[PDB]
Amino acid sequence: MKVEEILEKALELVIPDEEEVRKGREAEEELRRRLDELGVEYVFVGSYARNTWLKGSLEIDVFLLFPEEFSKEELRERGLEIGKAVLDSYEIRYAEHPYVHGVVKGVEVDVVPCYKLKEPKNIKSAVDRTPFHHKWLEGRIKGKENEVRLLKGFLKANGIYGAEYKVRGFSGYLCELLIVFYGSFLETVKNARRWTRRTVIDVAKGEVRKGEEFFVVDPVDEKRNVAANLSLDNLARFVHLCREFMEAPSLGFFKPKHPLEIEPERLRKIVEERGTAVFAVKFRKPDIVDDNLYPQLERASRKIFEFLERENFMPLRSAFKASEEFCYLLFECQIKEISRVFRRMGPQFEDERNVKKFLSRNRAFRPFIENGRWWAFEMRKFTTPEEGVRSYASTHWHTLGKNVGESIREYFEIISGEKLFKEPVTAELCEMMGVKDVCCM
Amino acid sequence: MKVEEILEKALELVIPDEEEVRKGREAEEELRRRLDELGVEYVFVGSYARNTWLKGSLEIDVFLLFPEEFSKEELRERGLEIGKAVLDSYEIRYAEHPYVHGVVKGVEVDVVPCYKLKEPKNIKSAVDRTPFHHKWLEGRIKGKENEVRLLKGFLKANGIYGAEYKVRGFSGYLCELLIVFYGSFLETVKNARRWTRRTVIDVAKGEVRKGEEFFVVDPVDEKRNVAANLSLDNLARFVHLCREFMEAPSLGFFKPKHPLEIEPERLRKIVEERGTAVFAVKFRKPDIVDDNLYPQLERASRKIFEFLERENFMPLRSAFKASEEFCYLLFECQIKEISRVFRRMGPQFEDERNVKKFLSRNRAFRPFIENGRWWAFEMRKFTTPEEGVRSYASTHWHTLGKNVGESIREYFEIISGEKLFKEPVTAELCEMMGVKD
RNA sequence: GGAAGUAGAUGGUUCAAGUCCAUUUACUUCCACC
RNA sequence: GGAAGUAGAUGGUUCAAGUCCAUUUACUUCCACC
Ligand SMILES: Nc1ccn([C@@H]2O[C@H](COP(=O)(O)OP(=O)(O)OP(=O)(O)O)[C@@H](O)[C@H]2O)c(=O)n1
Ligand SMILES: Nc1ccn([C@@H]2O[C@H](COP(=O)(O)OP(=O)(O)OP(=O)(O)O)[C@@H](O)[C@H]2O)c(=O)n1
Numbered sequence A: 001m002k003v004e005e006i007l008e009k010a011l012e013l014v015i016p017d018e019e020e021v022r023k024g025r026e027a028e029e030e031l032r033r034r035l036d037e038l039g040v041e042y043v044f045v046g047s048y049a050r051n052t053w054l055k056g057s058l059e060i061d062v063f064l065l066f067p068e069e070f071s072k073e074e075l076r077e078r079g080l081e082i083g084k085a086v087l088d089s090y091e092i093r094y095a096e097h098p099y100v101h102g103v104v105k106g107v108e109v110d111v112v113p114c115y116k117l118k119e120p121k122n123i124k125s126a127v128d129r130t131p132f133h134h135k136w137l138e139g140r141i142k143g144k145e146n147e148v149r150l151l152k153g154f155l156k157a158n159g160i161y162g163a164e165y166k167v168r169g170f171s172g173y174l175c176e177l178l179i180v181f182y183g184s185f186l187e188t189v190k191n192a193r194r195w196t197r198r199t200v201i202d203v204a205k206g207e208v209r210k211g212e213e214f215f216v217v218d219p220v221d222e223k224r225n226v227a228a229n230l231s232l233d234n235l236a237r238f239v240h241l242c243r244e245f246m247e248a249p250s251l252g253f254f255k256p257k258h259p260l261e262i263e264p265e266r267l268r269k270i271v272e273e274r275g276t277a278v279f280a281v282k283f284r285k286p287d288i289v290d291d292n293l294y295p296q297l298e299r300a301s302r303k304i305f306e307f308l309e310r311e312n313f314m315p316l317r318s319a320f321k322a323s324e325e326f327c328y329l330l331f332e333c334q335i336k337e338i339s340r341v342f343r344r345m346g347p348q349f350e351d352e353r354n355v356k357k358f359l360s361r362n363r364a365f366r367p368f369i370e371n372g373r374w375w376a377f378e379m380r381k382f383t384t385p386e387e388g389v390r391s392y393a394s395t396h397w398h399t400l401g402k403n404v405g406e407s408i409r410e411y412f413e414i415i416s417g418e419k420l421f422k423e424p425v426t427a428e429l430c431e432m433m434g435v436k437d438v439c440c441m
Numbered sequence B: 001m002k003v004e005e006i007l008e009k010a011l012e013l014v015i016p017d018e019e020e021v022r023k024g025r026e027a028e029e030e031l032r033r034r035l036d037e038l039g040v041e042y043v044f045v046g047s048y049a050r051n052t053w054l055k056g057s058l059e060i061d062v063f064l065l066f067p068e069e070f071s072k073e074e075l076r077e078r079g080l081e082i083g084k085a086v087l088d089s090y091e092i093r094y095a096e097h098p099y100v101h102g103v104v105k106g107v108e109v110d111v112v113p114c115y116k117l118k119e120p121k122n123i124k125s126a127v128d129r130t131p132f133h134h135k136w137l138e139g140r141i142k143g144k145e146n147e148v149r150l151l152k153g154f155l156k157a158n159g160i161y162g163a164e165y166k167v168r169g170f171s172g173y174l175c176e177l178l179i180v181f182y183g184s185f186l187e188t189v190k191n192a193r194r195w196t197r198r199t200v201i202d203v204a205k206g207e208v209r210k211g212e213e214f215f216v217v218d219p220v221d222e223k224r225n226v227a228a229n230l231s232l233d234n235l236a237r238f239v240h241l242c243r244e245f246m247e248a249p250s251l252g253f254f255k256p257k258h259p260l261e262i263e264p265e266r267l268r269k270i271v272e273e274r275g276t277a278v279f280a281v282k283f284r285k286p287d288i289v290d291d292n293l294y295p296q297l298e299r300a301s302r303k304i305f306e307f308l309e310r311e312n313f314m315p316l317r318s319a320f321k322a323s324e325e326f327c328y329l330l331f332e333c334q335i336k337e338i339s340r341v342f343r344r345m346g347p348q349f350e351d352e353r354n355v356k357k358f359l360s361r362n363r364a365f366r367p368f369i370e371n372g373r374w375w376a377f378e379m380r381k382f383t384t385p386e387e388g389v390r391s392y393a394s395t396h397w398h399t400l401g402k403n404v405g406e407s408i409r410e411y412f413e414i415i416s417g418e419k420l421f422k423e424p425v426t427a428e429l430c431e432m433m434g435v436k437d
Numbered sequence C, D: 001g002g003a004a005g006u007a008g009a010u011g012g013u014u015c016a017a018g019u020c021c022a023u024u025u026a027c028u029u030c031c032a033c034c
């Protein structure tokens, strides 16, 4: 099991075969023919145009180049026009920057409008750097595509490929820069082993330095962090995987792992072994794009976790899942049930003015003195984390994300017990509690 | 009803009737006759020697003055022999300083050996300051020394009289000094409201300055605090009580409240409504004096209390009770049961060597990363506060006071729920939980 | 949409809030959907 | 007996202990038992 023999096998998992390549060549040809004939300035960009796309992930990126004088309104009207004009069938769905997603001869295509700039300074739209990224990489990546494909494959198999909010990992463009920076997959992995949260990679300068955060300097624009949306945790996982890969190299690192169907009965056993409170907030999925929905689920998850922690339910971890129709916020707490009384701190016996109004209150028990200050016994209006959340989410829905919070206003319920183990959340449940052997292929 | 109308009606319960005084005089004489028969220099000090004892607190303090020639060990043997051959029956039991306690013609007596000195500063034993104390008070407390007996009665009714550990309150002498410093109990009550914990009262200089701590400076030794054993919380209680009295006066402030007997059934009801975990540590009371016991019971109570908090059972309060044959450490926690799993913080991801060690320990569940560490799920040995204290007391008996600890070491049990309300701890549980009716 | 920051405001909880729970106006950034 | 203080010496827990849990030696000051 030699390292180089491992990577040679890995190639068969990440290099697309002849039939896929040809399928994309045939599509490419058709697209060009349609876009000429339309007049229209365009440019193929991204992994297709650089032959760095992953086996089974063929998708062509076309960028339409407009006069910078155009309004943003004019950009979308025209982008959508041409995109629609050029794709066999199509779909329009985006967060901020408009574009058309479609198919040309059975292959995924994205037609994206942008601005024909010269110098990626000042930037009129979010995506204006992409043509420049391509000019830059074009001649610096020839002969190193398979190398980029290994890294991509390695990341994806470990669930940290892509910088969208659903994954918060490594973009494809980031993979290319790393390969340009280190020369090979093997060199990257070897080096990544010693990246820190303060690591700055400046590709254009061929330099590694200490900064305020992890920062991969864009060759085309130095104020840009190519790794802006890679989370601290995903960086950590990557660094750790590299360490593990070099200790014990294996083809396992390039094969995806799938959730495994775990029976409700065994889940009941694990939860009662841990003796925790496990429950979810269930509600209708708001009909919005992933990049709007996921940060909103992140916020909702966080605020309720914070509520649980200030309310002394000792939350362990937290998870979320989105189905076609429902979303789920998963929670685990050390405390299944708290007492009803608690102590509220009072004023120091010194100043009477405050002590007077502190004792003026009607309570059931009778304040006392401890360490030179008054304290009182007060009652909770809930004693289980479920009851707690039910109070929280009914009362604070507006702080849980624009659309997520709105959906919770109109309907939510709290599921625990067997009722929760038959929901499609077992993968997230297992992940959350760190159940061993979960997890396969 | 009004200002000084109440003080009249109280003086009935503080000043002793003539026939209690008459029993005590016929006991005083008999004592002089026995001591002089033996020769022996003797000074009378304390409350009886100043006419400041409560109606029922009849005790006589006698001090034996030994020449300094006799050493610390010679002192006590002769002081004991004298005390034994001067009291009808006698009891010897003390914490550090030797004395005989006994009865003459049916009257409580204390015989305490000490030294005769010129100059108070630079003590030999411990009580040497006391004759000096008295000779500073003989001509200063003269007159309406009933302003003391009201102050005493006040503090006694409210559970904060004596300055011994069981109480941690106001010394008898501390009372007589304040009456000299302010002029009268009422005037003392007026001022005590303004007292902080920074208050320093200098009877000698008439100086109400603000030092680092509550310090009643002794007229006989300025290095020494007369209030040195009154606790912070006990001070708080008085300062408040005075405020409560000043505004709305009542004779109730001089009557001791009946200790309040609540039935087991009502207590269980209170506790179940409270939703807490209430349990006690019961063990055999070690055969020691109060002043060695109570601080140990406190220890003890505190160390287990801290165990409970660092163990996330969120304790509310604690208390303790001493009986004939048993002691009880009383606890109430907000958490009746905790989960088996908990999180353990590991290292930051960069620190590759310590990550290896951390990840190499066998656990039931896969560790995880969160904000750049490395955390692990671990399993607890216990899930209930009672379960928890059973362990801590078993392993940490030695940190729980010399004797209390030794006693816990050989045996204790944990009493909770139904079994507990049958033990003599209900008054303590009521005070603890602030039960009110 | 989400996140950071700067300058105001409002409700609630509390003996007690610039600070805890929320709401809101103006502005400067940044990220994703490529 | 308990508490405060100064100089050390350990053992345990932990990825890691001058920081958490305990133990010990010497010098010191305090408190109650009056
Ligand atoms: N977060 C992102 C997303 C995209 N891009 C730019 O957009 C191009 C196209 O991105 P995308 O289609 O999302 O993926 P690819 O880079 O083409 O690679 P792959 O499809 O294999 O993920 C990239 O090359 C890059 O220049 C970027 O800079 N940062
Ligand atoms: N903590 C104390 C208590 C007592 N004493 C000295 O011991 C004398 C007698 O105190 P004690 O007999 O213990 O109580 P009484 O002063 O007699 O008060 P009472 O009779 O109400 O109990 C006091 O006058 C005082 O000089 C002292 O200095 N330190």
Ligand SMILES: [Ca+2]
Pocket (backbone or CB within 6 Å): A046, A047, A048, A059, A060, A061
């Ligand atoms: Ca693409």
